[PDB]
Amino acid sequence: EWIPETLYNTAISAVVDNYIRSRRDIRSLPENIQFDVYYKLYQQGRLCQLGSEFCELEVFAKVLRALDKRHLLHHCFQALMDHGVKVASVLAYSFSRRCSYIAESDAAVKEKAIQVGFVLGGFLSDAGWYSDAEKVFLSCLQLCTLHDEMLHWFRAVECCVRLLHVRNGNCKYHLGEETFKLAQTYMDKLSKHGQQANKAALYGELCALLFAKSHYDEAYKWCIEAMKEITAGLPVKVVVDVLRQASKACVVKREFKKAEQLIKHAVYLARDHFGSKHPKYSDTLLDYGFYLLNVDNICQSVAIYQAALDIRQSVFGGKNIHVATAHEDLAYSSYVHQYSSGKFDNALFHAERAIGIITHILPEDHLLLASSKRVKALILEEIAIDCHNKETEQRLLQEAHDLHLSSLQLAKKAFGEFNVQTAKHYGNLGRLYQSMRKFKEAEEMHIKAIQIKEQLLGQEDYEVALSVGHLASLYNYDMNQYENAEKLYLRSIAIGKKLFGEGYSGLEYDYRGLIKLYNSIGNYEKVFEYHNVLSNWNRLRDRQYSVTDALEDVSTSPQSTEEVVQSFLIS
């Protein structure tokens, strides 16, 4: 309707058009104007004029104090890193160099820098520059451990809970345990002087540290300890983080009743305070889609990951580790959802995009490449089977042969040989060797995959049963070991029935294997029965996936805080 522009917006464009002459005076403007002048430079595409000021710590500390427009700063900063200027590396180094210059100074300035280091390091941790946020927090931690005043131990843990968050996302787990041990040094000493600091965010990081190393028995131990310290007076960001990590640790313990009430509360709790276009809300959705994918609620799990990616594709620009983690999670879910269809074009595009981002920003010998290379390799081996060309089949399998063994070494070097991720990479090699006509190597991988999954996790688990069916399918379809596949097919189904009932989608690949099991040895009476069971599974499968999208499943105000924790704790 041709609404005239505000005099404020009109004066933004006039100052930006005369930026070079007045670049010194803009730095003396109020923070709300100063961010808007700098945001207009990004909108005009003048990233070099804008990026030459974000490289300065004092200027960036001023635009970090505009808290409401952080969704635009996270998008200018990401556009700057993609533009080719290392503002995250400079600001982390410029702060650390400046931080080390006030070590002998007074405690009045030494506390202002920690305030600057928490809004800067917390921004880089939010933006996904964990290798650079860690350098900021290590300087903030060094400030807390010089003068032994009462408030300093209250902040040294507050560094060590964020120093531990920037090492979990950076996969520095072997420094993660050293950080938590360092956190208790100031936590115990603070508790001595009549002040019990709240161990809620600190214990929640181990719920993600130990889950990442697949110490599920150990992670659930600290999952309970984290939620015992949740208080209604805590920040929502701290509370939301614990509920996500608790949900992640509860699902992998093969218990789902307690997990749904936590994450669904967390999705609503993040959608209330933050909104539907916040990085923290997208963090819940990826953890919420972690629930749906594992509990076989796969049809709506793609939308949750797609919703999470759409938030991160807007806030976090083009090439970010937070966009990449959303891509590699959506690609796996699109792999799982479209596994029955056999078409992998959206899934491969997301999987290729995730590795195209991680390889650009992270080193080629980094642990987050293990999950991204794995997801694409599962897609690559399934595209070549579905296509008819033999040369493409013999190349994509070898292309996926590169990724799994490259991924396996990353898991073996970091997590060790005896761990779930290492065993989970063996199971993918078991699928891989089966499709590469190397049948004898596929068996010894599956036996090694089970004997590790069965050992640490236990006899009855989702992960071990999912790989038994692959071993059962190997003994059945091609290498003609029908005497051994019978007990493995039933073992996989029995565990699947126990945790998922008849709605588990993998029973189709188990019932069809059982049909093939008896068509070559005899006992045709069970073929009719299992076909009926497959028929019984078929129409029962078409009863629950038609439920509405999980975004509105949480609804509005379903439950309340300090009650979901209590409901979880008693059970």
Partner: peptide, 7 residues
């Protein structure tokens, strides 16, 4: 589709 999804 002779097997299951990847873990």
């Amino acid at each position: 589709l002779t097997r299951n999804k990847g873990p």
